[PDB]
Amino acid sequence: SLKKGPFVDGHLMTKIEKLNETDKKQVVKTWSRRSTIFPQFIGHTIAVYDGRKHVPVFISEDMVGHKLGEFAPTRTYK
């Protein structure tokens, strides 16, 4: 829902809030493709599971509001 606000897994948001205590530094691996990219994520590289491997996606400004799985395409086709 949209009254409840944007969604993010609390397991992930904790990991990134620990990095926000320090200066980015570590790179978080997660399976929460469904988590919304908040402003707090900006500057991080997030390792997101695409079904087999973790895709390293650098988080920029325009990526805020989207989900993490928008940047980790699950199906290979050329």
Binding site: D62, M63, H66, G69, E70, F71, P73
Partner: protein, 108 residues
């Protein structure tokens, strides 16, 4: 000429505004209401005063190249993140979860 668009003369105003990119039926309806002018009058039968008022209301809206650019910078933005939707934009495939096997021809 309204928002840099020669709206047709013979057809009614509401219709003539639908040609203006960024104005549809319901926008044209609440334009002419906000203009305080009859929505049944004709473009050929309007006044230059009434045109001015219509033109003043439409300046508050994003229309034509202003809107075309807004839309185009979004196409930029999605191909500037390699998002699923971005890739679907550049590949010419459906971007909102439509199936491709058949019935995707508008995109293809």
């Amino acid at each position: 000429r309204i928002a840099g668009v020669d709206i047709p003369r013979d057809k009614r105003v509401v219709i003539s505004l639908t040609y203006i990119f960024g104005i549809g039926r319901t926008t044209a309806q609440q334009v002419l209401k906000e203009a305080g002018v009859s929505e049944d009058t004709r473009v050929r039968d309007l006044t230059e005063e009434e045109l001015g008022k219509i033109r003043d209301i439409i300046d508050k809206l994003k229309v034509e190249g202003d809107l075309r650019r807004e839309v185009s910078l979004n196409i930029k933005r999605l191909i500037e993140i390699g998002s699923y939707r971005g890739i679907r934009h550049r590949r010419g495939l459906p971007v909102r979860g439509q199936n491709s096997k058949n019935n995707a021809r508008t995109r293809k």
